[PDB]
């Protein structure tokens, strides 16, 4: 869809619950960066890309 997927971002998402994280850069679909975590149960959670906790979670995953 050519629209922002995250109308609000969620708090309290833990690394242990995350299966994957998708980072989508700005463009025609959305002028803001969007971060969507897919949890181990299949839930999708929109995350604040600016958040220092979100940056820490993604860098922890890369190790």
């Amino acid at each position, epitope marked *: 869809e*050519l*629209r*922002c997927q995250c*109308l609000q971002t969620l708090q309290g998402i833990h690394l242990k619950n995350i299966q994957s994280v998708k980072v989508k850069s*700005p*463009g*025609p*679909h*959305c*002028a*803001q960066t969007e971060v969507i975590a897919t949890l181990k149960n299949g839930q999708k959670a929109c995350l604040n890309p600016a958040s220092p906790m979100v940056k820490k979670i993604i860098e922890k995953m890369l190790k």
Partner: antibody, heavy 119, light 108 residues
Framework: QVQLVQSGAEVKKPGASVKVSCKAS????????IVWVRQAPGQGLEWMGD????????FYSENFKGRVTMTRDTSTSTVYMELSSLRSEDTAVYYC????????????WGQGTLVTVSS | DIQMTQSPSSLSASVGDRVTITCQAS??????LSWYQQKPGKAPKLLIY???RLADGVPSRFSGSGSGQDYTLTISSLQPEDFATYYC?????????FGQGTKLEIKR
């Protein structure tokens, strides 16, 4: 400091075409969509179509497909809407607007251009 | 296309009154709904986007609510400068479509 400046009012005869410009300033032109909305008597506001200023997407309303063309010029940060095969009923104010975070909402609007079609 | 029904088509209210304007979509638009104010001879101006978010610079007296097919714009304490026509816009499905507008008149 976002500004959208449109070309001045025009008068045209039936069968002519009109090309309205929308010059953008105060933001990165290629990161947003420009949409065209017309305001004709008894019809409130009507979306005509839109295009992504960075390229790749142009969409037209089925009510105007076949006689509307929208174009973009990155070097002048300008978008144009050309409406062809004009009829007296195309008399209306034509607005351009820039998208917000996406093309679902219109964050900034041009001042409008009144186009009158008359013999 | 999605039909947007705005209610009422016109209303009269006094300064300090709370004003409520509703917008109903013919199908679920998933909160891709925005509200605009238009003064006579002027371009529309954004008030609210994604159903509830207030645009930059817009006074806190404006608020939006709703989901699915039903949305509401509220002005908590009407001011003289709120004289205008108000429109809703959906873009949950293309083409985007507008409500017919609500003309807000001031009693004084």
């Amino acid at each position: 400091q976002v500004q959208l400046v449109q070309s001045g009012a025009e008068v045209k005869k039936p069968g002519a075409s009109v090309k309205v410009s929308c010059k953008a300033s105060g933001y990165t032109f290629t990161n947003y969509w420009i949409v065209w909305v017309r305001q004709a008597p008894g019809q409130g506001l009507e979306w005509m179509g839109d295009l992504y200023s960075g390229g790749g997407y142009t969409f037209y309303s089925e009510n105007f497909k076949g006689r509307v063309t929208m174009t973009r010029d990155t070097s002048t940060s300008t978008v144009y809407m050309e409406l062809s095969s004009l009829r007296s009923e195309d008399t209306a104010v034509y607005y351009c607007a820039r998208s917000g975070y996406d093309r679902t909402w219109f964050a900034h609007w041009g001042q409008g251009t009144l186009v009158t079609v008359s013999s | 296309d999605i039909q947007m029904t705005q209610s009422p088509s016109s209303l009269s209210a006094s300064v300090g009154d709370r004003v409520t304007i509703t917008c109903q979509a013919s199908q679920d638009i998933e909160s891709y709904l925005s509200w605009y104010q238009q003064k006579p001879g002027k371009a529309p101006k954004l008030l609210i986007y994604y159903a509830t978010r207030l645009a930059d610079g817009v006074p806190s007296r404006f608020s939006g609510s709703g989901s699915g097919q039903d949305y509401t714009l509220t002005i908590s304490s009407l001011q003289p400068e709120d004289f205008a026509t108000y429109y809703c816009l959906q873009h949950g499905e293309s083409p985007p479509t507008f409500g017919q507008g609500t003309k807000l008149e001031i009693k004084r």
